[PDB]
């Protein structure tokens, strides 16, 4: 009834109105245990962004490579082992440096997903409806990418073909 | 025989688990 | 080796000594209980426990040969078991 | 300091008060017994917990009860 | 003198050293802390659980890392019956050259590993010092996960409420199905995928596991229902473990008995066992009701269980709220179950060795059995102690009573005198007669006429052995008979393996028993009954007795009620635990003495020595202790030393700690307060030391603290001296 | 609710809202049939014919599971009969 | 699950508005000081006092590393191993087959020199009332104010100059260890490469 995604079920109590992308999709009632939807939305958006970047990297590594030889592997899962540990540890340290401040931030803030990242100011001057539309676009694209990046990983692990 | 790199990174990871332990210890209060 | 599973073939190893001890120990317990209950209805029950009434003691002790019969004649009359005058702790 | 409670089973026989080594108990007027007196514990800060008070109690399960609690240099009997 | 016992202001105001001592011993009694609520209690317990699991995983990771780094795991793989496993290296500056030479193993002084981790890890499919390192890395990662979770669930928005903590049905469904069944399913997956091929020479690592089929048919029989295909072609009787010679292709079989080479359970047997356990527990995890309208409400189940004629009172009506609202009832139940479970582990890992080449590792066998039996005794005593604590501080008679009539738990306090009297009668019966028979054998053998001994054949236990297939006592009962329906039923499934193992003199599976086994089992029964008597008496009498009809008002642990009313020493329920610890130690000592002597005679071959000398006490004293203590005490002599020197030092150390416990137990307070006062005067009245003064007034240890310290010394000395003796005796006698 | 009882038989609510509405004349014969079927399945999988890897017969196994069940069905049948159902 | 609340409404996180703005360095310092007092009040941890002391030690240790490379190159730094018969079994490292490999004598000498310097440090630590700059913060003393991303460009023997040089030396040590770990050569080999060859010549 109240779920748009599952037009027959009634959504849970915490799925209503605000927090764009709310289509009443919580059949298992996971939202009933979390105190609020702030942390789960932060986790969902982090997954969405990481999955978008992962899909883009998957395709680009399929087609484009860095000039060096160590980056010449086309299969992303094989490149996970072919690439030297120095590059991967540098990436991990960069991510952890970004992650510790946001670790302090996420567990207490009202909008843990709002990291203040807008270098090009794509949101300055946008109205509330436009901002909500942008949030919906981001969430949609992220969910589709998550499904897609998991599918790419599965098909590479099951057939060895990294794409198509 | 394990290498110096293997033992060193295990020591580094053990340090990280130590900082997580004091955070739990301090969060369980004085 | 003693075969004490209960078979009468090796009955002289455990079963017959078991019956003998049960008789003797029931005799002892019965005469002790009878003496306790008998001097428990006198003016000075505690005095007759450190200074035994040897006449009454001898009278009771030689009467223990019927302890299996006396026990299953006092249990039937309800004189063997107390009911609720027994004391209990707080909980 | 330890906790000392008095219960209305008190018969006012004064044996608790005259057994206290630290002057914790005293006899106060009452109307719940023949003697017209009941024990009181107005100086429990000096209570040492030796429980001499309830060793002299003749009532069935006591009328003065000592509950050991937080310790103090007075309650620990420390001359130093 | 302040701020240390942050959780207790009453202790923080103590001007004496008692504040420091009591601050340690009350740190984990969260229910007694100042400014305490139930929500904070459950949240703190939850975080402490997380930290504890992290500690366990870190300990396992450390064992893995030290075996990988300083052990000889790889060398032990190629020769498991001759190479002695190494636990970790030794660096001690106090060593002389002789100690370095004696403890020297390969490249550095090291300790032999008696934990049996080598055999366990080899069985589950580890062949490289890099496999152990991966396990250590993963376990440290898991410890980090658990520490992060423990920190997280103390944060404001992530702290669970009381309703979540007391949600019994959800926790049971998940624990049973998820934890037990799914962990068994994952363990079956690992067993098959990795362990089964690794025992057959095929390496299945974290690289070629998505492409190496655990079975040649590959999941086709499972979906097709042809589940027999996974049992076809098992490992032959000439299979060399870890090699493809004589191997098979089956992954789930019934074989029974042991591997002909490793003398341990078949890996395909254990995989099938865990798969069956997984299915059963996953099924059983759907019993209780959750958000989907089907299942059980355990309150209704408990309330509806009242016998109609009426002999349990009103039944179990008040038990749901009693257990839910008490953390000591649940803790006691869990501790009792864990004690029974670890007793089961001890009793089954020697009769049915599950790890390759563990049967021939006699020192590790003895160490494992002793360790698990001692842990079992500790857990049982803890269960009873927490039952007593529940009686003192959590039991509510009103909840367990409906209109005067009492429920199943409240009725245990009505016939408490009957229970205690009959426990006392059983204990006296067993003690009197076991000691009588033992002393009769002592006197009769001493007078040179051993034929007059009273030796009772354990026919009841031998009857059970024959029922399981042992054709040694000529009973021809159930599985000792080839015509009984019990034998014809499994003649094609697991009897040929089981019979071949039970009817073998080199196994520990159903060891042959005689009159000595009878007498020692009666001694064990006496010990169990007396420990149970002490613990049950303390639990039931916790809320009060005739000597103290208000014992519940004084708490679980208090020193006494004074010298009045004849004297009230050791009257609290804590004192019952304290007294029962000695009896638990004695009972576990009897059990471990019996096990170790039986297995020393079995391994050495002189089983006639046990069967003859175990019927009288001097036989034990002379042939077990005095005989096998010779290698241990000669770990260092005025002529030299051996690698057993550390065990002799630990032997003497245990004796010393035992006797210091004797100090703390025999001599009580009051004698130590006046001496401390004299010392205080001496310090206060001496120059050059008056400049230094204490901040906390030095006082003697409290009565309860003194009892605890004496018990701790007694127990630590007991454990250390027996561990040293068993290990050193096994090592020095059996090569 | 109130599964607690003190009379001769428990209330029908203890059977769940599926067995609470079965007439006893249905549960009784059903319980007897289930017991007979389960005993026969157990005696056909084992006892009469020795078990083997090639002979497991999910019908006999599933069947045999009706013996434990039978116990519950006739307990419920008695409960329904005593509750005028 | 559904008929109850897993987290009570009374236990909910509140956003800390007191850290508005407050760049990650200020936020981290404030979080450390509030979360761990009595070690923050001593100046330990992410503090300007600790940073200054560690920078001084890093500069002195760059000097020590140069000296060690020079000593190794110029025939100093004694040869062989320690005498187990003279210094006990604690100096024995391993026994391969009948020979005891001991701690190198050069390592022992370098440890003795480091012991000299560390002893000087320990004396200065337990000499707070007679040293110009203390190791820890007095109760009341407040930590010097962080220098920021770029300390003031004040040449000479100034606090800013020592601060900048200590930061540079600590970063250099971090880079040296990172290069040695990533590439796989000895620390002195990395220093030799980073000096062209003028050290181990
Ligand atoms: C997002 C939608 C999506 C789309 C368009 C495809 C499209 C395709 N998948 Mg795929 N897949 C997806 C999601 C998707 N998948 C997900 C969510 C999973 C599970 C994580 C998989 C798992 C999967 C496997 C295991 C395989 C494919 C294969 C294929 C190809 C046939 C085709 C290109 C197959 C193929 O050709 O692999 C190259 C194949 O073997 N997919
Ligand atoms: C002679 C009378 C007598 C009788 C009928 C009983 C009967 C009983 N006693 Mg008992 N008891 C007695 C004397 C007696 N006792 C004495 C004298 C003592 C002090 C040592 C005890 C100490 C005792 C304990 C500690 C326990 C019992 C228990 C029991 C019960 C179980 C049986 C048992 O364990 O035996 C126990 C018997 C003994 C330990 C030995 C008794 C010592 C001698 C043989 C008895 C005295 C003989 C007496 C002098 C004869 C004089 C009579 C003469 C003048 C006419 C049972 C109700 C147990 C119980 O409660 O179970 C329900 C239990 O735990 N009793
Ligand atoms: C599938 C979901 C799931 C899983 C895997 C777990 C798992 C766990 N929970 Mg948990 N929990 C869940 C859902 C789940 N929970 C839910 C939904 C709730 C809310 C209702 C809770 C509420 C909850 C609380 C409040 C607590 C836990 C705790 C724990 C941990 C217990 C300690 C441990 O490591 O045991 C490991 C145990 C095993 C791996 C198995 C033990 C094997 C036994 C001993 C052998 C028995 C075999 C046999 C029966 C022996 C007898 C022989 C037979 C013949 C009778 C464990 C990690 C506790 C903890 O430590 O928190 C960190 C704790 O305090 N949980
Ligand atoms: C009348 C309907 C009907 C019937 C009788 C069956 C019967 C069967 N199906 Mg099946 N199936 C059906 C409808 C049906 N299906 C539908 C509607 C779908 C989806 C469109 C499937 C999809 C399906 C798959 C994907 C598979 C089967 C398989 C099987 C066989 C395995 C049974 C077994 O041993 O349990 C096995 C027991 C367990 C797995 C656990 C207990 C069995 C003959 C399996 C097979 O290989 O058959 C040869 C198999 O892999 N079925
Ligand atoms: C998982 C099991 C478990 C859990 C959760 C608890 C939890 C609890 N128990 Mg409990 N207990 C357990 C098992 C458990 N126990 C077992 C197995 C026993 C039997 C031995 C007991 C016996 C017991 C008693 C008798 C009491 C408790 C109490 C308590 C409560 C406070 C604990 C406290 O203050 O610690 C204090 C911790 C210490 C004093 C540390 C003691 C450390 C010992 C001495 C070992 C250290 C020596 C070490 C081996 C050194 C080696 C020497 C070297 C030379 C080799 C708490 C609720 C107390 C309470 O008030 O409950 C309400 C209480 O009176 N428990
Ligand atoms: C070798 C030492 C020794 C012996 C023989 C006993 C004997 C006994 N203890 Mg015991 N105990 C001991 C050491 C010992 N304890 C120590 C060190 C502690 C730690 C403080 C305890 C703590 C303890 C508790 C807490 C309890 C016992 C109980 C018992 C009795 C158990 C019933 C029984 O066996 O009756 C048979 C008796 C014997 C075999 C010994 C006496 C028989 C002699 C030889 C007769 C000789 C006649 C001439 C029994 C009297 C329990 C009890 O009273 O049960 C009723 C009980 O509750 N004991
Ligand atoms: C163990 C390694 C080690 C080493 C090599 C040094 C090296 C040094 N410390 Mg030092 N220090 C150390 C550990 C160490 N410290 C520790 C652990 C502490 C804490 C107690 C200190 C506390 C400390 C203080 C408080 C001082 C030093 C000082 C010094 C310098 C004295 C050398 C000199 O006189 O130059 C010529 C030198 C940089 C002094 C300094 O700054 O240089 C003169 C100084 O005042 N250190
Ligand atoms: C990358 C992406 C968006 C990236 C946007 C970025 C970084 C924007 C960053 C900024 O705005 C911020 C944040 C703040 C501004 O102030 C600054 C900038 C910097 C401007 C979306 C991808 C979104 C990606 C999506 C939705 C991908 C969907 C993929 C699908 C359906 C793939 C399907 C398949 O892969 C399978 C499954 C199997 C294959 O075999 C077959 C096919 C069909 C190829
Ligand atoms: C790089 C470093 C620290 C980096 C920290 C970072 C990026 C922190 C980032 C964050 O905080 C933010 C930004 C925001 C937070 O919310 C989150 C995180 C992510 C946490 C420290 C180096 C620190 C490096 C140090 C301290 C080096 C010390 C060296 C000394 C003392 C010298 C010793 C010697 O001289 C002797 C003693 C003897 C000689 O023989 C040998 C030598 C070694 C030469
Ligand atoms: C300051 C220093 C040493 C100072 C020494 C002092 C004061 C000694 C003082 C003395 O009193 C003593 C103690 C003892 C006396 O007997 C001797 C004297 C001399 C009198 C070393 C710094 C040493 C500093 C070093 C080695 C710096 C290395 C930096 C690197 C590699 C930087 C790399 C990057 O810059 C790139 C390349 C690209 C960027 O984008 C990224 C990064 C990574 C930042
Ligand atoms: C104090 C108290 C408590 C505690 C208690 C305890 C601690 C108990 C213990 C208990 C126990 C510890 C018990 C045990 C039991 C056991 C059993 C019950 C067993 C059974 C078994 C069986 C039944 C078996 C059978 C068989 C056989 C014999 C053969 C084979 C097969 C079969 C299976 C058939 C609580 C807390 C609760 C509460 C409060 C009070
Ligand atoms: S303890 Fe009993 S006696 Fe000693 S003082 Fe307090 S009350 Fe008087």
TrEMBL record, chain C:
It comes from the Eukaryota. The chain crosses the membrane at residues 14-30, 50-70. Participates in efficiency of electron transfer from plastocyanin to P700 (or cytochrome c553 in algae and cyanobacteria). This plastocyanin-docking protein contributes to the specific association of plastocyanin to PSI. Belongs to the PsaF family. This is Photosystem I reaction center subunit III.
TrEMBL record, chain D:
Residues 1-30, 38-67 form the 4Fe-4S ferredoxin-type domain. [4Fe-4S] cluster 2 binds at residues 20, 47, 50, 53. It catalyses: reduced [plastocyanin] + hnu + oxidized [2Fe-2S]-[ferredoxin] = oxidized [plastocyanin] + reduced [2Fe-2S]-[ferredoxin]. It is an enzyme of class 1 (oxidoreductase). Keywords: 4Fe-4S, Chloroplast, Electron transport, Iron, Iron-sulfur, Membrane, Metal-binding, Oxidoreductase, Photosynthesis, Photosystem I, Plastid, Repeat, Thylakoid, Transport. Apoprotein for the two 4Fe-4S centers FA and FB of photosystem I (PSI); essential for photochemical activity. FB is the terminal electron acceptor of PSI, donating electrons to ferredoxin. The C-terminus interacts with PsaA/B/D and helps assemble the protein into the PSI complex. Required for binding of PsaD and PsaE to PSI. PSI is a plastocyanin/cytochrome c6-ferredoxin oxidoreductase, converting photonic excitation into a charge separation, which transfers an electron from the donor P700 chlorophyll pair to the spectroscopically characterized acceptors A0, A1, FX, FA and FB in turn. The eukaryotic PSI reaction center is composed of at least 11 subunits. One of its GO terms (molecular function) is 4 iron, 4 sulfur cluster binding. NCBIfam families: PS_I_psaC. It is found in: Plastid thylakoid membrane; Plastid, Chloroplast thylakoid membrane. Its main location: plastid. [4Fe-4S] cluster 1 binds at residues 10, 13, 16, 57. Binds 2 [4Fe-4S] clusters. Cluster 2 is most probably the spectroscopically characterized electron acceptor FA and cluster 1 is most probably FB. This is Photosystem I iron-sulfur center. One of its GO terms (cellular component) is chloroplast thylakoid membrane. The gene is psaC. Coiled coil: none annotated. It holds the Pfam family Fer4_7. Its cofactor is [4Fe-4S] cluster. GO terms for biological process: photosynthetic electron transport in photosystem I. It is a peripheral membrane protein. Its EC number is 1.97.1.12.
From TrEMBL, chain E:
It is found in: Plastid, Chloroplast thylakoid membrane. Its main location: plastid. It is a multi-pass membrane protein. Its EC number is 1.97.1.12. SUPFAM superfamilies: Photosystem I subunits PsaA/PsaB (SSF81558). GO terms for molecular function: 4 iron, 4 sulfur cluster binding; chlorophyll binding; electron transfer activity; magnesium ion binding; oxidoreductase activity. PROSITE patterns: PHOTOSYSTEM_I_PSAAB. InterPro entries: PSI_PsaA/B, PSI_PsaA/B_CS, PSI_PsaA/B_sf, PSI_PsaB. GO terms for biological process: photosynthesis. It comes from the Eukaryota. GO terms for cellular component: chloroplast thylakoid membrane; photosystem I. Keywords: 4Fe-4S, Chlorophyll, Chloroplast, Chromophore, Electron transport, Iron, Iron-sulfur, Magnesium, Membrane, Metal-binding, Oxidoreductase, Photosynthesis, Photosystem I, Plastid, Thylakoid, Transmembrane, Transmembrane helix, Transport. Gene3D superfamilies: Photosystem I PsaA/PsaB. The keyword Transcription does not apply. Phylloquinone binds at residue 672. The chain crosses the membrane at residues 50-69, 132-154, 175-196, 270-288, 331-352, 372-392, 419-439, 518-540, 576-597, 646-666, 708-731. The PsaA/B heterodimer binds the P700 chlorophyll special pair and subsequent electron acceptors. PSI consists of a core antenna complex that captures photons, and an electron transfer chain that converts photonic excitation into a charge separation. The eukaryotic PSI reaction center is composed of at least 11 subunits. NCBIfam families: psaB (TIGR01336). PsaA and PsaB bind P700, the primary electron donor of photosystem I (PSI), as well as the electron acceptors A0, A1 and FX. PSI is a plastocyanin/cytochrome c6-ferredoxin oxidoreductase, converting photonic excitation into a charge separation, which transfers an electron from the donor P700 chlorophyll pair to the spectroscopically characterized acceptors A0, A1, FX, FA and FB in turn. Oxidized P700 is reduced on the lumenal side of the thylakoid membrane by plastocyanin or cytochrome c6. This is Photosystem I P700 chlorophyll a apoprotein A2. It comes from Nannochloropsis oceanica. The gene is psaB.
């Amino acid at each position: 009834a109240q779920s748009k995604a599952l037009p027959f079920l009634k959504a849970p109590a915490k799925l209503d109105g605000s927090l764009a992308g709310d289509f009443g999709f919580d059949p298992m009632g996971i939202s009933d245990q979390v105190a609020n939807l702030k942390y789960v939305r932060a986790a969902e958006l982090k997954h969405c962004r990481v999955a978008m970047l992962g899909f883009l990297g998957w395709v680009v590594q399929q087609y484009v490579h860095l000039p060096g030889e160590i980056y010449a592997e086309s299969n992303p899962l094989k490149a996970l082992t072919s690439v030297p540990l120095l590059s991967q540890i540098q990436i991990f340290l960069f991510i952890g440096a970004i992650e510790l401040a946001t670790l302090d931030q996420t567990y207490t803030a009202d909008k843990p997903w709002d990291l203040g990242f807008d270098p090009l100011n794509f949101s300055k001057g946008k109205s509330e409806q436009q901002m909500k539309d942008l949030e919906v676009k981001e969430l949609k694209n992220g969910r589709v990418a998550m499904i897609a990046i998991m599918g790419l990983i599965a098909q590479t692990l099951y057939t060895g073909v990294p794409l198509f | 025989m394990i290498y110096d790199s293997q033992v060193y990174i295990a020591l580094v990871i053990a340090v990280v688990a130590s900082v997580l332990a004091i955070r739990l210890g301090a969060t369980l209060y004085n | 080796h003693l075969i004490t599973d209960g078979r009468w073939s090796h009955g002289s190893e455990f079963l017959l000594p078991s019956i003998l001890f049960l008789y003797i120990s029931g005799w002892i317990g019965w005469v002790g209980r009878k003496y306790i209950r008998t001097v428990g209805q006198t003016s000075n029950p505690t005095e007759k426990e450190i200074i035994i009434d040897v006449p009454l003691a001898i009278s009771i002790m030689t009467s223990g040969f019927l302890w299996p019969f006396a026990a299953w004649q006092e249990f039937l009359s309800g004189d063997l078991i107390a009911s609720d005058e027994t004391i209990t702790t707080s909980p | 300091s330890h906790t000392v409670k008095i219960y209305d089973t008190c018969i006012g026989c004064t044996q608790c008060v005259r057994a206290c080594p630290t002057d914790v108990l005293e006899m106060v007027p009452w109307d719940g017994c023949k003697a017209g007196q009941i024990a009181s514990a107005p100086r429990t800060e000096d209570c040492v917990g030796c429980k001499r008070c309830e060793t002299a109690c003749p009532t069935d399960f006591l009328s003065v009860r000592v509950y050991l609690g937080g310790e103090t240099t007075r309650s620990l009997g420390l001359a130093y | 003198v302040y701020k240390f016992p942050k959780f207790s202001k009453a202790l923080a105001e103590d001007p004496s050293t008692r504040r420091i001592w009591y601050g340690i011993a009350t740190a984990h009694d969260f229910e007694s802390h100042d400014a305490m609520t139930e929500s904070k209690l459950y949240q703190k317990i939850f975080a402490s659980h997380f930290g504890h699991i992290a500690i366990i995983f870190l300990w396992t990771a450390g064992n893995l890392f030290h075996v990988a780094w300083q052990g000889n795991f790889e060398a032990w793989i190629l020769n498991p019956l001759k190479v002695r496993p190494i636990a970790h290296a030794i660096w001690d500056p106090h060593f002389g050259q002789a100690a370095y030479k004696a403890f020297l193993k390969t490249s550095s002084p090291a300790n032999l590993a008696l934990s049996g981790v080598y055999e366990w890890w080899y069985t589950i499919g580890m062949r490289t010092n890099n496999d152990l390192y991966q396990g250590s890395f993963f376990l440290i990662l898991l410890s980090s996960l658990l520490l992060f979770a423990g920190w997280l669930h103390l944060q404001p928005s992530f702290r669970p409420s009381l309703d979540w903590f007391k949600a019994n049905e959800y926790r049971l469904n998940h624990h049973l199905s998820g934890l037990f069944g799914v962990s068994s399913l994952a363990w079956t997956g690992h067993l098959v995928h990795v362990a089964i091929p690794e025992s057959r020479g095929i390496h299945v690592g974290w690289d070629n596991f998505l492409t190496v089929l655990p079975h040649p048919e590959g999941l086709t029989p499972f979906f097709s229902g042809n589940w027999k295909a996974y049992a076809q072609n098992p490992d032959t009787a000439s299979h060399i473990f870890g090699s493809g010679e004589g191997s098979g292709t089956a992954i789930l079989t019934f074989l029974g008995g042991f591997h002909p080479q490793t003398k341990s359970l078949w890996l395909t047997d254990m995989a099938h066992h865990h798969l069956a356990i997984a299915v059963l527990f996953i099924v059983a995890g759907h019993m209780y009701r959750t958000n989907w309208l089907i299942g059980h409400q355990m309150k209704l189940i408990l309330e509806a269980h009242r016998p109609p004629g009426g002999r349990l009172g009103i039944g179990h009506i008040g038990l749901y709220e009693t257990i839910t609202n008490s953390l000591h009832f649940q803790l006691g139940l869990a501790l009792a179950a864990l004690g029974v479970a670890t007793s089961l582990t001890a009793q089954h890992m020697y009769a049915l060795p599950p790890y390759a080449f563990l049967a021939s590792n006699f020192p590790t066998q003895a160490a494992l059995y002793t360790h698990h039996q001692y842990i079992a005794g500790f857990l049982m005593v803890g269960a009873f102690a927490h039952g007593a604590i529940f009686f003192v501080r959590d039991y509510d008679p009103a909840v367990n009573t409906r209109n005067g009539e009492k429920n199943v738990l409240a009725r245990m306090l009505e016939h408490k005198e009957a229970i205690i009297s009959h426990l006392s009668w059983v204990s006296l019966f067993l003690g009197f007669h076991t000691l009588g028979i033992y002393v009769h054998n002592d006197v009769v053998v001493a007078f040179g006429q051993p034929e007059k001994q009273i030796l009772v054949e354990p026919l009841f236990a031998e009857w059970i052995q024959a029922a399981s297939g042992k054709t040694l006592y000529n009973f021809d009962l159930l599985l000792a008979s080839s015509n009984s329906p019990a034998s014809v039923a499994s003649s094609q499934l697991w009897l040929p393996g089981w019979l071949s193992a039970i009817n073998d003199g080199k196994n520990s599976l159903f060891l042959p028993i005689g009159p000595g086994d009878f007498l020692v089992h009666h001694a064990i029964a006496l010990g169990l009954h007396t420990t149970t008597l002490i613990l049950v008496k303390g639990a039931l009498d916790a809320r009060g007795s005739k000597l103290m009809p208000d014992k519940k008002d004084f708490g679980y642990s208090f020193p006494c009620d004074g010298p009045g009313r004849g004297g009230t020493c050791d009257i609290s329920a804590w004192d019952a635990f304290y007294l029962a610890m000695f009896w638990m130690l004695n009972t576990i000592g009897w059990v471990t003495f019996y096990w170790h002597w039986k297995h020393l005679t079995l391994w050495q071959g002189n089983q006639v020595q046990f069967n003859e000398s175990s019927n009288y006490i001097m036989g034990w004293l002379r042939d077990y202790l005095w005989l096998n203590s010779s290698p241990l005490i000669n770990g260092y002599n005025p002529f030299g030393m051996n690698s057993l020197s550390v065990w002799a030092w630990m032997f003497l150390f245990g004796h010393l700690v035992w006797a210091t416990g004797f100090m703390f137990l025999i001599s009580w307070r009051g004698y130590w307060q006046e001496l401390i006062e004299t010392i205080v005067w001496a310090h206060e009245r001496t120059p050059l030391a008056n400049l230094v003064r204490w901040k906390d007034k030095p006082v003697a240890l409290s009565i309860v603290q003194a009892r605890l310290v004496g018990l701790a010394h007694f127990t630590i000395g007991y454990v250390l001296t027996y561990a040293a003796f068993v290990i050193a005796s096994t090592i020095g006698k059996l090569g | 609710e109130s599964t607690y009882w003190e009379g001769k038989a428990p209330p029908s609510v203890v059977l769940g809202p599926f067995l609470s509405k079965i007439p006893s004349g249905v549960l009784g014969p059903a319980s007897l049939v289930a017991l007979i079927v389960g005993s026969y399945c157990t005696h056909e999988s084992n006892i009469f014919n020795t078990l083997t890897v090639d002979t497991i017969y999910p019908a006999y196994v599933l069947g045999s599971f009706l013996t434990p069940i039978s116990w519950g069905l006739h307990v419920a049948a008695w409960i329904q009969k005593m509750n005028k159902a | 699950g559904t008929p109850f609340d897993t987290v009570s409404k009374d236990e909910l996180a509140v956003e800390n508005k007191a850290m508005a703005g407050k760049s990650v360095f200020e936020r981290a310092m404030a979080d450390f000081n509030g979360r761990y007092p009595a070690v923050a009040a001593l100046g330990l941890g992410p503090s300007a006092k600790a940073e200054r002391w560690n920078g001084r030690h890093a500069m002195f240790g760059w000097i020590v590393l140069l000296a060690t490379g020079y000593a190794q190159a110029h025939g100093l730094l004694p040869e062989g191993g320690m005498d187990a018969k003279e210094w006990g079994t604690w100096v024995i490292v391993s026994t391969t087959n009948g020979e005891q490999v001991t701690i190198p004598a050069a390592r022992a000498a370098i440890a003795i020199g480091h012991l000299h310097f560390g002893a000087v440090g320990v004396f200065a630590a337990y000499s707070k009332n007679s040293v110009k700059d203390r190791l820890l913060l007095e109760p009341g003393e407040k930590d010097e104010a962080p220098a920021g991303l770029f300390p003031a460009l004040r040449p000479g023997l100034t606090k800013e100059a020592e601060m900048l040089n200590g930061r540079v030396a600590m970063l250099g040590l971090v880079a040296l260890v990172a290069v040695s770990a990533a590439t796989g050569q000895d620390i002195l080999s990395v220093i030799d490469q980073g000096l062209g060859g003028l050290l181990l010549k």
